[model samples]
Target: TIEIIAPLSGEIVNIEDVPDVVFAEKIVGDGIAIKPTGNKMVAPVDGTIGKIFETNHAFSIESDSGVELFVHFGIDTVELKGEGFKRIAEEGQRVKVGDTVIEFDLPLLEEKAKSTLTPVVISNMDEIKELIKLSGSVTVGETPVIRIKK
Candidate 1:
């Protein structure tokens, strides 16, 4: 059993029930999409920052356990080209749980009329046995987003 913690502290932006996706608006485009309070985008179990997208919209981390997690903010907000967003951490920097990875200027993104629905995806889901969503409301940087069975 593996535990998944909140990557940062923030408010729950939008939670989708159909696809079981939870969208957390971390500031603006710096939001996250998870599996309805589960399958959260947490600090990688191990490893350092692998790469950061130029637009600060998405990032990838390689865990010491040889696992990789990708966290992306907004669907197509990247097309906005760094508008109302900033990267808080640099590539190759080591980060722990609750670290401020990115910050989004929500108002600025809204001004441009961009959807702030972010998605936190386990890009490589084949390694895990199952990803379970704990039942409850998850606050930013406080709640247990998901449980991984290995």
Candidate 2:
């Protein structure tokens, strides 16, 4: 069994409302979304930083046990050209759950991006045997949003 936590604090939500059909359709993977309230994004599990996009809009972490979790901060944020985003951690770095990977200007994102609804998903869903999604508000890096049985 493994767990995926929230990388940002906010109201936990279903991915269907995330504003993008790619994530809404679970083309990337199956999981949940968060109406983020914070500017910092952390690792959802103890893992290696798999990839952090050059635009700093999204990243993925691969857990030791092999759960590949993908996190996209906002909708159409790639169009920002990395204006308000900062990559604190580099790709391929080892990290524990809650380690900050990226930081962004919350107000700036809210102003220019499509939406602040971030989607946290298991990019490699085939490894998941069961997934339980928790609702309501969640605290960054501490709240277990999805409990997975592999």
For residue 5, what is the lDDT in candidate 1? 61
Error of 2 at 75 (Å): 0.5
Local accuracy of candidate 2 as per-residue lDDT tens digits, 1-150: 677888989999888988999999999898999988998999989989998999987998899988998899988888889989999999999999899999989998899988888999988988778888889999999998998899
* Model 2 misplaced stretches (Cα beyond 4 Å): none
TM-score of 2: 0.97
Query: Model 1 reaches what TM-score against the true structure?
Result: 0.70
Q: Which candidate number would show the highest lDDT if scored against the true structure?
A: 2
What lDDT would each prediction earn against the true structure? Answer: 0.56, 0.90
What is candidate 1's lDDT per residue for 102-146, written digit by digit as tens?
676656655573454545545556676777655435655567655
- Model 2 residue 30 CA deviation (Å) reads 0.7
